[PDB]
Structure 1
Amino acid sequence: CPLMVKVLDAVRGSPAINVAVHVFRKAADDTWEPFASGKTSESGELHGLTTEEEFVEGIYKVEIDTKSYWKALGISPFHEHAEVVFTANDSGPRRYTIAALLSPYSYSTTAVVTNP
């Protein structure tokens, strides 16, 4: 599993469950092609998005539908979504965890890159 997404709720102190996540790769045409998506589990995590064969170097975008999450809780949010855009670079066996911590008017995101 070369790419995992984890989403946390800073208002409830809980995993953010049932959040839609979409992953795009930048094409040679310089446009966003979708290629993976899912919803976060009870633990706030989304696994199995891609494989080591498919997850080649390139520019990637991870979109997290935070607005629908806050609306589901009856909280009016600021952002339409959280967007994380990054370059995947090969330099050894690497796994990427994209974490996002959500509040109605703020989010944080960090990348944890590790060699198994």
Structure 2
Amino acid sequence: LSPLSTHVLNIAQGVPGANMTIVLHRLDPVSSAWNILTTGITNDDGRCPGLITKENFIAGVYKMRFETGKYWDALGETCFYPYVEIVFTITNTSQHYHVPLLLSRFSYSTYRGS
């Protein structure tokens, strides 16, 4: 299983944030440009298994971009945030990191889990 996980929750409607596109990036330590690692689409439970392998999960700065505008558009409603990018520092690669997103049309929140 992936050492990096997520969970998207639609807190306006009280259901998982299903079928949301998420793109995972890692900061290039040489040039400070962003490199794309992979993309995923959350399942029915708002989760996105297999984002990265233990082998590729090296220390660095990572970015998860949630396509929140597109998600809401597919539910027939507008979102204040066209997308959400969460940028976080990974230093100890043996810990598990859970990076969730609690979302409404006009709010969001996240926290570090394990």
Q: TM-score range by the shorter chain?
A: over 0.9
Alignment correspondent of 1:88: 90
Task: Kindly report which structure 2 residues correspond to 1:89-108, keeping only aligned pairs within 5 A, or say none.
Answer: 89-90=91-92, 93-108=94-109
Deviations 1:3-44 (A, max 9, x none): 011100011100000000000000021011000210001110
Alignment correspondent of 1:3: 4
Task: Kindly report which structure 2 residues correspond to 1:58-73, keeping only aligned pairs within 5 A, or say none.
Answer: 58-73=60-75
- Which runs of no fewer than 5 residues in structure 2 stay unpaired? none
Report the RMSD for the aligned CA atoms in angstroms. 1.0
CA distance in 1, matches of 2:100, 2:92: 20
How far residue 90 of structure 1 moved from its aligned partner, in angstroms, is 1.4
Counterpart of 1:9, as a letter, is N
TM-score by length of 2: 0.94
Aligned length: 112
- Residue 41 of structure 2, aligned match among 39, 42, 55: 39
CA distance in 2, matches of 1:96, 1:10: 22
Alignment correspondent of 1:77: 79
How far residue 110 of structure 1 moved from its aligned partner, in angstroms, is 1.2
Deviations 1:23-80 (A, max 9, x none): 0000021011000210001110001011111000000000000000111111111001
Q: Which has the higher strand share?
A: 1
CA distance in 2, matches of 1:82, 1:108: 10
Query: Among the aligned pairs, what percent are the same residue?
Result: 35
TM-score by length of 1: 0.93
Alignment correspondent of 1:23: 24
Counterpart of 1:68, as a letter, is K
- Residue 54 of structure 1, aligned match among 56, 71, 79: 56
